[PDB]
Structure formats: C-alpha cells, structure tokens
Design a protein around this ligand. Structure first.
Ligand SMILES: NCC[C@H](C(=O)Nc1ccc2[nH]nc(NC(=O)c3ccccc3)c2c1)c1cccc(Cl)c1
Ligand SMILES: [Cl-]
Lengths: 340, 8
C-alpha cells in the first residue's frame, strides 16, 4: 500500500517527530476518523502549532476533500468578524500521496466538554453563549454568495478555541455543499439529522438549524435529544416530542412510508407500543422548566429562572419547527429574547 | 454510543 507509507485502509502511519518538507514537525496523532487522521504538528516557518488533517489515499475521499478545501477557501474571502466562528484553513498540500489540510490548532469539542460535567450538562449561561456563536456562524454560512450547508453539525464538530474560555468554532466541512450543489441523501449524523433528510425531501440551510436545536438541548441536559438506533427509531423519537409532522409535509415526502402510513382519507399515522404517544414527551419537562432544570439541578441558580427556561424552550421549538420554510433563521434567532 | 457521520 503506497510503498509502505499507507496501510490497508488508506491511513498514513503517523510517526512522532517526523519532519515533513523541512517545515512541519509531527508531534503526535490526536484524532482518528472515517476520512483520515488529524495530527498535532509544529510549523517551523510560522513558529506555531497546527492541526494537520491527513486525508485518505483514495479518489472518492480526495474528490470530496477538494470541495471542502474549495468551501473553506471561499469562506476565507469574506472579511466579516463572523468567519471567526469557522475553523481557519491555513493551507493545503499533497504529501506522500495524502491530501493534507493545515488548520489552526483548537482545543477540545463540546462532547468532551459535557464529559467534564459527567454528562450533567453545562449551565444555561454557557449554553446561551454557545447558541449565540452558532447562530452567528449559521448567519455567516447563509451569506447569499456562500449559501453553505454544513450537513453534519453535532457536538464533535464544534471545538473550543481554549479549554478555559467559551469561544467555539465549527470544524469539518467534509460533508458540506452549497445550495443547489447537493450530492447525497443520507447525510447528517443520525442524532442531529433533520426530518427533511429523514423523509427524503429537498433540503436547504434549515437542516443545520435543526441540528443546532438538538445540540443546544443536549449541551444543557448532557444527553442527546433524539437518540435513534436507526431512522425509524429516530423518526419515532422526534414524534414523541413534536407530534406527527403536518399533513402538508408528509403528502410531499417520498419516504413518508418508511415511518408513517396514510389513511385513505388523507390523515397520517405511525406504522402498525414502545414509544410514548406523539407530542407527549414535552421539551417543557425534558428541560425541567418549572422543576428546577434538567434533573432539578439548577434550582436556585442565577440565570435559571422559569422565565429563562421559557425563553430557551421557545427558541428551541422555533429551531425544531417541522417546516423548513418557517423554521427560525439565524438572523431572527439572534434577535430572540433568550439573547436579550 | 455516538453515531457517526455517513461515509463514502
Ligand atoms: N468529524 C470529526 C472532526 C474531527 C476533528 O476534530 N477535526 C479537527 C479539525 C481542526 C482542528 N484544529 N484543532 C483541532 N484540535 C484537535 O484535534 C484536538 C484533539 C485532542 C484534544 C484537543 C483538540 C482540530 C480538530 C476529525 C477527527 C478525526 C479525523 C478527522 Cl479526518 C476529523
Ligand atoms: Cl476536520
């Protein structure tokens, strides 16, 4: 496999202290993923640490990473402070047959952050700071000349800039596309996948807002909102909280029938009892609004009033609107009372 | 358990 540089599944065998191109000193392997690896390297020229994403030596992955590179380079031509919620690509090169993207070095992701709390949740104040930054990143991506859909927003793809501070960035535009250049129907990580993607419908930037809504509840409860083992189970778990989707969407959905059944009179139902009846698992209770927050652990904390939890719940319900046409958009999200 | 980006 590539003269002993690659392995049988196309990864570079990382070796600590290897120097690439009289420039990058590889320190260590920090992450392994389905598309490649990330290594910590020191760049001698710029005298700084960088994270180098080493992609697979196979054409399919190389072809998708070239779009990623293209999207990151496109984003870097906008001077707006908003692009700073997106990880920065410093450069890219080919090395021993792997495409390599050099990124700024960031700290750990928000799943790892919940892990510090033993999955009890970060506070509402921190959740709100994350929410404002993500809404701003989504606003940036919705810039008409970008119109970028991330397509895989989840806690693992949001990284803290530093362990002791609350600034975050979005990483991994490896499944991303621009509006009108869609390619795959099976997208988004399952917990964070929108109904539109589940029902096989056309989709747009709103799918990222759905992911963000699921993410923000999880950051505060410590637990995924909708933890499906598969699509049917995923849909049923969405239905426990938000009810049966509207008829007008179901009538247009190509895969309605994977999850639902349409009676001769038009009205739609779940296929023919493990799940709670539809709409009976209220976010009001999942968040513990009047019962002291998640697990009643935020009873008496500043910033965690019934009023606050009511603003948070509201914003989330607007992010989890079944209709992509009316689902809250970043510009309006940023004006919601939760952020006042 | 944590899924899990759809793959190529
Ligand atoms: N879909 C998951 C995206 C990650 C990922 O975290 N990519 C990064 C991109 C850019 C970046 N800049 N600093 C980073 N920090 C870390 O990787 C890291 C690792 C361990 C502890 C703190 C920070 C990172 C990580 C990933 C992981 C493994 C392989 C790939 Cl190809 C991508
Ligand atoms: Cl990445």
């Amino acid at each position: 496999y590539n003269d002993g540089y690659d392995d049988d599944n196309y990864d570079y065998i990382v070796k600590n202290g290897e120097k690439w191109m009289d420039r990058y000193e590889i320190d260590s392997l920090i992450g392994k993923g389905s598309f490649g690896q990330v290594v910590k390297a020191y760049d001698r020229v710029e005298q700084e640490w960088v994270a180098i994403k080493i992609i697979k030596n196979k054409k399919a992955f190389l072809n998708q990473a070239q779009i990623e590179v293209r999207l990151l380079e496109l984003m870097n031509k906008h001077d707006t402070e908003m692009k700073y919620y997106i990880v920065h690509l410093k450069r890219h090169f080919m090395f021993r047959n792997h495409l390599c993207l050099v990124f700024e070095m960031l700290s750990y992701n928000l799943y790892d952050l919940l892990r510090n709390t033993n999955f009890r949740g970060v506070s509402l104040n921190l959740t709100r700071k994350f929410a404002q930054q993500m809404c701003t990143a989504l606003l940036f991506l919705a810039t008409p000349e970008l119109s970028i859909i991330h397509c895989d927003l989840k806690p693992e793809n949001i990284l803290l800039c530093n362990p002791k501070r609350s600034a975050i960035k979005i990483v991994d535009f490896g499944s991303s596309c621009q509006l009108g250049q869609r390619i795959y129907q099976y997208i988004q990580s399952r917990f964070y996948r929108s109904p539109e993607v589940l029902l096989g419908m056309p989709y747009d930037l709103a799918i990222d807002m759905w992911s963000l809504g699921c993410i923000l509840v999880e950051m505060h409860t410590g637990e995924p909102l909708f933890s499906g083992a598969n699509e049917v189970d995923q849909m049923n778990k969405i239905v426990e909280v938000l009810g049966i989707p509207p008829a007008h969407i179901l009538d247009q959905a190509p895969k309605a029938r994977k999850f639902f059944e349409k009676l001769p009179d038009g009205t739609w139902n779940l296929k023919k009892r493990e799940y709670k009846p539809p709409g009976t698992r209220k976010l009001h209770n999942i968040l513990g609004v009047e019962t002291g927050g998640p697990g009643g652990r935020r009873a008496g904390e500043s910033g965690h009033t019934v009023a606050d939890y009511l603003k948070f719940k509201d914003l989330i319900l607007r992010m989890l609107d079944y209709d992509p046409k009316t689902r809250i958009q970043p510009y309006y999200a940023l004006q919601h009372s939760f952020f006042k | 358990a944590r899924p899990g980006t759809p793959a190529l």
